[PDB]
Design a protein around this ligand. Structure first.
Ligand SMILES: Cc1cc(C(=O)Nc2cnn(C)c2)no1
Length: 185
């Protein structure tokens, strides 16, 4: 792909984070803590899952960023509406305001309803995410495999401002403690 020149500098929004997440000083890395991180509750925090939003809001244009997923067993990545539900149980779908892919139990899937199997020969260590607001497109790229396409959501109905979306996943196994990292431009 040739989307690199739309690179944006994403930072994580502490106020949206699940209360168990640990965000680095530079707001560029996040991992699951082994306990509650001693923050007050608020209506923005994702309560049920280890999720956090980017601080940036996008309502036009073309945007690109990259995330490091090295050694993780489980994670979700993409974008979502600013007004997605924060509390209780929900599925990641475009109907609920999410355009995402994930790793779970050694398979990669796109967050359609129902979910779509992805075909990845080279397990990615870094994922590129491209959003074209006007075109209604969200695309995912395998940076480890020379930028090869993973998945394109087209005919997207954003219906609001978009925010970068992250889920570091649970760590029931003891094998999923590694962070998500926003990679430098
Ligand atoms: C302060 C403050 C308020 C809340 C709050 O309302 N949380 C909530 C709402 N619905 N559910 C299921 C949880 N959390 O912190």
């Amino acid at each position: 792909h040739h989307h690199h020149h739309h690179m944006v500098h994403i930072t994580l929004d502490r106020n949206t984070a699940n209360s168990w997440l640990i965000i680095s000083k530079d707001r560029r890395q996040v991992r699951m803590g082994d306990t509650h991180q001693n923050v007050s509750d608020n209506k923005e925090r994702f309560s049920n899952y280890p999720m956090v939003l980017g601080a940036q809001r996008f309502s036009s244009g073309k945007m690109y960023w990259e995330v490091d997923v090295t050694q993780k067993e489980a994670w979700d990545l993409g974008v979502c509406r600013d007004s997605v539900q924060r509390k209780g149980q929900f599925s990641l779908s475009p109907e609920n305001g999410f355009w995402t892919i994930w790793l779970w139990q050694d398979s990669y899937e796109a967050g359609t309803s129902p979910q779509t199997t992805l075909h990845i020969q080279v397990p990615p260590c870094q994922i590129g995410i491209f959003v074209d607001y006007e075109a209604g497109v969200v695309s995912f790229y395998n940076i480890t495999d020379h930028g090869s396409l993973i998945y394109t959501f087209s005919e997207c109905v954003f219906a609001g401002p978009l925010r970068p979306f992250f889920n570091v996943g649970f760590n029931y196994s003891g094998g999923n403690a590694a962070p998500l990292k926003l990679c430098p431009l």
